[PDB]
Structure formats: C-alpha cells, structure tokens
C-alpha cells in the first residue's frame, strides 16, 4: 500500500501471448511459495498442527533425497551384461 | 468353430486374382504371398464369383428366412424384385417422354437406394437410472445403422399388411414407396431422430 504499483508480481506480455505471461506469473508465484501460503491461509492452522506438518515435510524431503541418491549412485552400474553366459 | 484360428477368410473376387501383378498395391501384394503359407476356409454355400451376387440383398434374404427355409426366402425376394420391375415398366410405358427419363426400372438400384433412405444416423439405447427409464441419444455404427434399416422394412411388411396380401406385394410397394422418401419406414427413421433431439439433455446420463 506504500510501495510502488506495477513493479511487484508483474510480468510483461510478449507479442500478445497473454496466456504465456499468465502461465509464467503462476510459476513465479508458486516457486516463491505465495500459492501455498494463500491456499493454507484460508483457514486457521493451529500451532501444534503447523509444527507437526513442518517436521513431516522435512523428514519427507530428507528421505526422498537419499533414496534418489541411492538410485542415482547405481545408475551407472546398470549397463549391458559384460559376463553373459556366466 | 471347427476352423482353427489360423484359418483365413476366402477371397472370391475374380478380378482381384487376375489383375496384373504391377496393378496391386504392395500391401495387397504382400497378403497374396503370405496366404500361400496359410490355411484358407472353404467357401460358404452362398459365396460365388457370380456377377449377379449382391451382398446386401443376400443379407436381406437371410433376415427374412424362417427355420432355415432359404428356398422360400430367396423366392420371396426374387418375386419382390420382379414385382418392382413390373410396377416400373407399367409406369414407364404409361408415361410421357419427359417423365419416362426420371422413372427408374432397375430393381437392384431401387432396393439399395430404398434401404439407404431408411438408415438412421443416431440411435436410442434405453437406460434405467433411479427407478425410471431414461433413454439417451447414441451414435450408431455402420453395421448397426444398416441392420436397423433392413429390420424395420422386414417388420413393417410382416405385420402391418392385410391378411390376404403377400410379402412380394407389400415389400415391393414399400421399397418403391421408401425409394421416394414417403413410406412408413421413413417415418420410423424420422421418429427415432426426433426423439433423440428431445433427449439431447439426457445424453450425459
């Protein structure tokens, strides 16, 4: 309300591709976490539930990264059988 | 079936086998060489290379047959074609030169164009939802659309005719009356389409 208007959250349309501008603005507002914030802020999440949710996300992200690491660590060993017949 | 699944339907087209080799598309050319190493089903009793054999009329004959009496059903269709040819010959001779041009005296061409005029584009399949009968607009295949035209003709003549009239005389009068798009069978097609329009909203169900 005190800042300058049209600098924040503003994308510019290139060659009349109005849909591409909107679709990019969505990817911006989602990468920055504004989309999740607006959705969650519709109803009150109680402090105990917020902490349970954030602790679960962190442990969920750690387990998904390590499991990807194990799969990607053995991505190179998946090759044609060198010892076919034995 | 007594034919193993490896058996192939026979091809009874006289011109196809005698065509020059170069005139055949490579897809058709491939099938010929393949069929040399396959099993071929024996041809049916009603399958011949005759130039007078029409598949549409042959199908119409079987849909009239009762209890395997093919001789009678074929006789009725033969009498029908003749009854239509004789009805157009009378009209042609008793018409002016200008009118004579339009008059069609080929029974095979009146039969095909009659059936086509009675074929319905869309259909109605009756469904039951929530304890009521909601029939909904449906689209019909080329096989279902043709069957309905033939079935509606064989049923108008069988039922809605005087007691002493015969099928060759009622069917001839309907193929010609349908051929002009004014028969009762045409009304059956019109009623099917008009109901589908009414049930446009119920298509979702």
């Amino acid at each position: 309300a005190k800042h300058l208007k049209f600098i924040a959250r503003t994308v510019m349309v290139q060659e009349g591709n109005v849909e591409g501008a909107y679709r990019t603005l969505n990817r911006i507002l989602t990468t920055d976490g504004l989309t999740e914030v607006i959705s969650r802020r519709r109803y009150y999440e109680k402090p105990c539930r917020r902490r349970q949710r954030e602790s679960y996300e962190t442990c969920r992200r750690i387990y998904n990264m390590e499991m990807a690491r194990k799969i990607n660590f053995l991505m190179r060993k998946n090759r044609a059988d060198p010892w076919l017949g034995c | 079936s007594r034919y193993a699944p490896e058996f192939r339907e026979p091809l009874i087209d006289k011109e196809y086998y005698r065509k020059p080799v170069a005139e055949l598309t490579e897809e058709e050319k491939y099938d010929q060489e393949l069929k040399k190493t396959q099993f071929i089903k024996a041809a049916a009793a009603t399958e011949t290379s005759s130039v007078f054999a029409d598949p549409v009329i042959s199908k119409f004959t079987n849909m009239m047959m009762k209890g395997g009496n093919k001789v009678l059903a074929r006789s009725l269709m033969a009498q029908t074609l003749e009854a239509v040819k004789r009805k157009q010959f009378e009209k042609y001779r008793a018409a002016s030169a200008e009118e004579q041009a339009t008059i069609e005296r080929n029974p095979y061409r009146i039969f095909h164009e009659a059936l086509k005029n009675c074929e319905p584009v869309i259909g109605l399949v009756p469904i039951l939802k929530g304890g009521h009968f909601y029939q909904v607009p449906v689209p019909l295949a080329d096989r279902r659309r043709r069957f309905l035209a033939m079935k509606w003709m064989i049923t108008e003549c069988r039922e809605n005719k005087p007691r002493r009239t015969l099928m060759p005389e009622k069917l001839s009068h309907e193929l010609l009356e349908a051929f002009h798009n004014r028969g009762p069978v045409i009304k059956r097609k019109h009623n099917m389409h008009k109901m589908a329009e009414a049930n446009r909203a119920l298509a979702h169900y």
Binding site: K5, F6, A8, T10, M12, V13, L29, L34, T35, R41 | -
Partner: protein, 137 residues
C-alpha cells in the same frame, strides 16, 4: 536486444509505447477472482471507472456464478463496455485466486482488448488477522 519480462520502471525513459501511450498511462483491468464471484472493473490510469462486469451481473446464479465459463462471459462483457468507451490496451491486475482468475483474462482478450502485462495483487498478510476456523466435514 531481448524482451524483458520485468515491467518498465516508473520515472524513467523507455522506448515501449502502445498506441502512442506510455506504460503508466495504459488503463488497468482490475479482476477480483474470489471462490464464488469473479468481478471485473476497468479504470483509466487516473482512476476513473470505465467498464464494470461480474458473473452475477451477466445473470449467472449461485454455483454457476463461480465457474470458469461464467467469468469468461464477465470479461467479454467488460471488454465490450470498455471498447465502446475507447480502450484498446489494458494492464491486468488480477487480485484473488478463484476459479475465474484466468477465465476473466481470457474473456477480455476475446472481447477485443489487448493485454500488455499481468500483475498479481492477491492479499498476503505478513503475520495480520486470524483466519476463520477450519471446516469439519
């Protein structure tokens, strides 16, 4: 020598002009997309109202008032009123995150208005008012 997604900077000199208008002058299309009704208002850069529309005024009612096709009609209606008043280029500030958020912008394009930019003004409090309690269903 490439296109810039970032808008022109107010108070500077730019080569971007639309119909002989600078960016600060192009009229603004304010879209309030809520979960029930999508309202649209078009104003000049001096804050003078030119067109107004919404799913309700078009004639949609209750749950239909909050559909994508309902908002599209509202945008086409606002475009026509704006086009009559003499508007060809609009800056789209879309508040709200409802179903007709995009459809309202699509209707404005179908109505003959040329969108040059899309801004977002969805209210995001920084810590604010306690939201209503969660629904139990």
């Amino acid at each position: 020598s490439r296109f810039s997604l970032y808008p022109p900077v107010p108070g500077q000199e730019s080569s971007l002009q639309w119909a002989g208008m600078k960016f600060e002058d192009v009229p603004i299309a304010h879209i309030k997309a809520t979960y029930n009704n999508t309202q649209i208002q078009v104003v000049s850069a001096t804050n003078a109202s030119l067109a107004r529309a919404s799913c309700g005024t078009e004639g949609f009612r209750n749950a239909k008032k909050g559909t994508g096709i309902a908002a599209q009609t509202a945008g086409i209606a606002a475009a026509a009123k704006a086009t009559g008043k003499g508007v060809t280029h609009i800056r789209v500030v879309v508040k709200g995150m409802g179903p007709g958020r995009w459809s309202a912008i699509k209707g404005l394009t179908m109505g003959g208005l040329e969108v040059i930019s899309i801004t977002d003004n969805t209210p995001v409090p920084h810590x604010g008012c306690r939201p209503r309690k969660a629904r139990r269903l």
